[PDB]
């Protein structure tokens, strides 16, 4: 219904650049939002992801095992 909103750990800008759309991290190496309850060693950081190279989204990377 009305009043909902999705939040993401990383700020990104979607834009058009035929017309190709890309998603880029709003900043470089920015710490992730909503990430104050992870183990200290996780050091959450926003990382740029690519499709093969086109910036395709911005995601929060955790330094932990899989």
């Amino acid at each position: 219904v009305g009043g909902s909103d999705e939040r993401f750990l990383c700020r990104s800008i979607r834009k058009l650049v035929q017309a190709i759309q890309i998603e880029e991290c709003e900043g470089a190496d920015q710490p992730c939002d909503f990430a104050a309850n992870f183990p200290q060693s996780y050091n959450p950081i926003c990382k740029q992801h690519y499709t093969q190279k086109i910036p395709s989204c911005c995601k929060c990377a955790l330094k932990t095992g899989l």
Binding site: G2, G3, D5, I13, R14, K15, L16, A19, Q21, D33, A36, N37, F38, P39, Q40
Partner: protein
């Protein structure tokens, strides 16, 4: 309102350009800009995003004109400047935006502090968010008359909020003040917000919370104060939060918690104390006891031990995460009341043992995580009441023994992970060789789906895995110690797409028999140290085309990276590429003649005797031919044989192939020729003639005759006639020479030779 038509139209009279994309529209202003002042994303009826790149408040002049967006739920404005002494509603009016429910204003380019005027005409909003990283000040009259707001979020490094900010927020249900700089709870605010349910205060610096801080907060259902650098809490801090159901205390600095911290909070449903930033040795007595509605606990704080009364009479608990602490054991009574527990996670602790009675009452447990601990055994009692358990994870422990009755009562179990342990199932080698029917401890679990035993010390494919587990889907035996396979080891009866991994074992032989119940099982045999000798012949034929017995089609073997380890000649070459006659087994010197090497080729059942010292005058003592053998090749090339022995000679009597090229033979008697002979190479010897008795013997029998000093006179007539009618048996017929001058024998007639 705004749709496909308005967007297409926007080009021709366009200071701005518009392009549809998926279900939305992207508008940029100005049209030809690399760095547009405005980029609008419109999803009709749903939301409008205004992305700004402004230097000045006058830049708003470059907004699109006559957009007529219409009714829309959410307006999100990003990086925009606060529009001076003008309401934000005026920007929205300009765009024709009607009755939004939600306004988000996120920007690091403010140009000024936010004011109450900025929200004029937006008193109808249900949801408002203001977010900035600029040094800024929020005036406490900002939210005057916002009597419709149910959800408020403010993020602006806020050090304090005067109480009067909350004067008109009678409809407020959620507060999100996470990630500010709050040091104190504002006083007397909760009486202003009698419907308040969610209080988010994480990532602040609230180091002085006391009971009075929450006076009047009886409506509050959730409080989250994670990451507030909190070292201690008074025991009565939450006394007024009588209806609270969720509390988050994570990422703080507790070295202890006081007893009775939740005594007045009897509606608790979930508590989180995760990632405490210092060691918290234990939790106080009965901290989570006597809670009739408590279901979920997340506890990670380097806990060293727990008191047995921690959850007493809290019968509704369904989920406990106790992973990543320092627990060495658990008191036996810890879970005595947890009749409804569904999931227990104790992964990543230091558990050396669990009391046999620990899971006596958790009869509803479905998921049990014990991985990354130091457990050494599974006893007959530990899981005996766990009839409902579905997955058991005990990866990376030090498991060495499994009681024979460990899994008799776990009929519900479907997924069993015991990977990376020291499990050998204590199996005697002769019992295995003598093909004894031996059930593993897992044999009771006919319904099992996953059995992961990767990286243990299993040496044998047990009976129950093949014949009792008819539903088995995955059987990981990789990195174990299996040393050989027979067809019986691959006879799994499961009809549920069984995949077995036998990679990285110690598989040196795979012995499938000559001789040539309707399932299909995949088996991965890659990365094993296979010895490629005569003993793997039929396996090799199976792997390629030739051999496809009855059992062969019940399974599908993966061998694409199964590679010979031995012998040196074949080392490195993938099993599929092997040529079957290359598979040989040596015949040792006792058998094998002194300066000779001998081997057996199973592909055609040949005993091959090679003697190439180059110095032999006689045929040495030969080994007897096994009665299962058909061919015997005697290789005596380039020696100096003076004569052959008689055909009655032991060993030599059974030779089927004589390879004698390059010797000193001056005559051949038929009684020197072995009876099963089919090939006689006597080229490059010292022969002058062949008796008609030898020629009769040669009539299949194959011959080489060139390189000999043939005497072509009248006594050679039978030899001449033999060669003329035996084009098939004499490969080097054209190279035979008569040495009385030297002339090719094929150039001689019977008249030329014999007047």
């Amino acid at each position: 309102s705004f749709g496909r038509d308005a967007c297409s139209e926007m080009s021709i009279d366009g200071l701005c350009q518009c392009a549809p994309i998926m279900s939305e529209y992207e508008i940029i202003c100005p049209a030809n800009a690399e760095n547009p002042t405005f980029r609008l994303t419109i999803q009709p009826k749903d939301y409008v995003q205004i992305m700004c790149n402004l230097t000045d408040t006058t830049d708003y002049q470059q907004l699109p004109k006559k957009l007529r967006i219409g009714e829309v739920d959410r307006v999100q404005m990003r990086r925009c400047m606060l529009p001076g002494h003008t309401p934000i509603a005026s920007i929205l009016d300009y765009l024709g935006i009607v009755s939004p429910t939600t306004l988000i204003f996120e920007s690091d380019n403010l140009g000024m502090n936010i004011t109450r005027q900025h929200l004029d005409r937006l008193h109808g909003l249900k949801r408002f968010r203001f977010t900035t990283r600029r040094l800024t000040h929020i005036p406490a009259n900002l939210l005057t008359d916002m009597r419709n707001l149910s959800h408020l979020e403010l993020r602006a490094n806020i050090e304090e909020m005067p109480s009067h900010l909350f004067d008109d927020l009678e409809n407020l249900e959620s507060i999100e003040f996470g990630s500010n700089k709050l040091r104190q709870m504002p006083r007397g605010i909760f009486g202003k917000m009698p419907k308040l349910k969610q209080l988010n205060l994480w990532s602040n610096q609230l180091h002085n919370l006391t009971k009075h801080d929450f006076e009047g907060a009886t409506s509050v259902l959730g409080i989250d104060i994670h990451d507030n650098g909190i070292e201690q809490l008074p025991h009565d801090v939450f006394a007024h939060l009588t209806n609270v159901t969720d509390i988050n205390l994570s990422a703080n600095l507790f070295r202890s918690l006081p007893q009775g911290l939740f005594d007045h909070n009897k509606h608790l449903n979930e508590v989180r104390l995760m990632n405490n930033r210092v060691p918290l040795a234990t939790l106080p007595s009965r901290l989570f006891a006597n809670q009739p509605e408590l279901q979920i606990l997340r506890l990670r704080a380097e806990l060293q031990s727990l008191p047995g009364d921690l959850f007493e009479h809290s019968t509704q608990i369904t989920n406990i995460s106790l992973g990543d602490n320092l627990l060495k054991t658990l008191p036996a009574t810890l879970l005595e009341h947890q009749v409804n527990l569904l999931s227990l996670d104790l992964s990543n602790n230091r558990l050396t043992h669990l009391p046999d009675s620990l899971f006596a009452h958790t009869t509803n447990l479905t998921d049990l995580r014990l991985e990354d601990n130091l457990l050494t055994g599974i006893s007959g009692d530990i899981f005996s009441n766990l009839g409902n358990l579905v997955t058991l994870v005990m990866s990376r422990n030090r498991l060495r023994t499994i009681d024979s009755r460990a899994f008799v009562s776990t009929n519900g179990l479907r997924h069993l992970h015991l990977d990376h342990n020291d499990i050998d199932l204590q199996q005697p080698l002769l019992d295995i060789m003598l093909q004894t029917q031996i059930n593993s401890p897992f044999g009771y679990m006919h319904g099992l789906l996953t059995l992961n035993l990767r990286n243990n010390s299993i040496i044998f494919v047990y009976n129950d895995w093949k014949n009792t587990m008819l539903q088995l889907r995955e059987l990981d035996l990789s990195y174990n110690n299996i040393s050989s396979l027979g067809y019986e080891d691959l006879a799994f009866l499961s009809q549920n797409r069984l995949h077995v991994n036998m990679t990285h074992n110690k598989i040196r032989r795979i012995a499938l028999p000559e001789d040539v119940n309707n399932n299909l099982v995949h088996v991965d045999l890659n990365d094993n140290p296979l010895v490629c000798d005569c003993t793997i012949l039929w396996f090799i034929q199976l792997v390629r085309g030739v051999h496809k017995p009855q059992y062969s089609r019940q399974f599908k073997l993966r061998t694409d990276r199964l590679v010979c380890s031995q012998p040196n000649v074949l080392e490195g070459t993938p099993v599929r590429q092997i040529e079957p006659q290359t598979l040989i087994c040596p015949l040792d010197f006792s058998k094998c003649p002194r300066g000779c090497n001998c081997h057996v080729r199973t592909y055609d059942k040949a005993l091959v005797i090679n003697c190439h010292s180059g110095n032999l005058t006689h045929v040495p003592r030969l080994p007897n031919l096994h009665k299962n053998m058909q061919l015997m090749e005697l290789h005596l090339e380039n020696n100096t044989l003076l004569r052959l022995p008689s055909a009655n000679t032991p060993g030599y009597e059974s030779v089927t192939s004589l390879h004698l090229a390059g010797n000193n033979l001056t005559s051949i008697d038929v009684d020197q020729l072995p009876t099963n002979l089919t090939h006689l190479d006597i080229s490059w010897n010292h022969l002058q003639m062949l008796n008609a008795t030898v020629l009769g013997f040669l009539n299949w029998r194959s011959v080489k005759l060139s390189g000999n000093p043939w005497m072509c006179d009248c006594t050679a007539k039978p030899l001449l006639l033999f060669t003329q009618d035996n084009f098939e048996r004499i490969g080097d017929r054209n190279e035979m020479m008569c040495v009385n001058a030297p002339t090719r024998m094929v150039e001689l007639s019977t008249n030329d030779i014999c007047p």
